[PDB]
Design a protein around this ligand. Sequence first.
Ligand code: HEC
Ligand code: HEC
Lengths: 157, 157
Amino acid sequence: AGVAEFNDKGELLLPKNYREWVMVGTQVTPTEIRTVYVDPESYAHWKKTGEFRDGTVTVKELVSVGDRKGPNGYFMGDYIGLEASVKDSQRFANEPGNWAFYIFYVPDTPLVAAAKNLPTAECAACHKENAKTDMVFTQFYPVLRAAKATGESGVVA
Amino acid sequence: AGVAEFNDKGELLLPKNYREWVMVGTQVTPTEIRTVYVDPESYAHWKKTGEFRDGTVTVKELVSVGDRKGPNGYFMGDYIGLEASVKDSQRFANEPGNWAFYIFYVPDTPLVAAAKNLPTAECAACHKENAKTDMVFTQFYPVLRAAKATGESGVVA
Ligand code: HEC
Ligand code: HEC
């Protein structure tokens, strides 16, 4: 059933300590950096199978960009947004791929402790139309690639 | 003593599964993305104390940049390099801050299974001269900031 926690009305509670999950890719929009996490048990399953288990949770964390000069570059600035997706064949039996999509906050919609699953036109449509693997954009996540192709979570000599 | 493993001649062995460690910041050079990891036990200590324990290992992983068009952005491409640093008051009693610095590979120096600690002019000098906190560039690592300032590894409502 996985790591997702839901309140009585079925809203997804803010995942806890997700920055300790496995970071699978980071993207930059030319302004924003996005960091993508997969919960450790789902990542472990992925290593073994190249599949997203029932109960998989992903988190996408949005940051502004800081500028470094010397001793030049960009770095993760302020946290400005948080999205998540959850796979559950039972709870989301009627959603495409059994995935539900969520916004916790973005440039201003204020932060909620619990989020309602979003309509397919808003989120799932793009994902199911374009994502390489089961509605997750693994074409952009080299941590997952090395994990699936070789069972590894790092370079090996 | 921490997670670092050394061979008989005192060379640091390639850390294993470091992409499962805690990613503390990602940087972009305007061409390359760099991802920075802190081993989970040292991260846990940091959460509690705002200090790098004896035995702390950090890893900096270097990637080329892929280009995404639709459905525009940049993403982590090919792995092209790996550096590490290790704090040990006993093993590195004679190094600045007791930190040793290492290159496993970069655009071509080929990959080694084990790396020798590098001279201070090459690595430690810049770090000890410019890094905010104990020779680690925490001024650029917002995961560590939120962890130290609030004990949190994620946004809380
Ligand atoms: C990244 C994303 C993630 C990370 C996990 C994954 O499925 O890859 C989540 C949980 C999420 N988004 Fe999503 N999205 C798109 C692309 C190309 C990427 C990876 C590349 C990058 O980050 O730069 C995503 C694409 C799209 C998209 C195309 C027009 C739409 C309309 C959406 N995404 C919409 C949503 C959501 C609705 C608010 C939502 C909660 C998402 N995405 C979650
Ligand atoms: C990042 C780095 C890390 C990550 C941990 C940390 O100490 O912050 C390691 C293990 C490492 N480098 Fe390092 N370095 C510099 C800066 C500003 C950052 C963070 C910003 C970013 O990644 O864009 C670093 C600075 C410098 C520098 C200034 C001229 C020098 C000469 C070096 N660094 C040299 C080295 C190493 C010698 C080959 C080496 C093994 C490093 N750094 C490791």
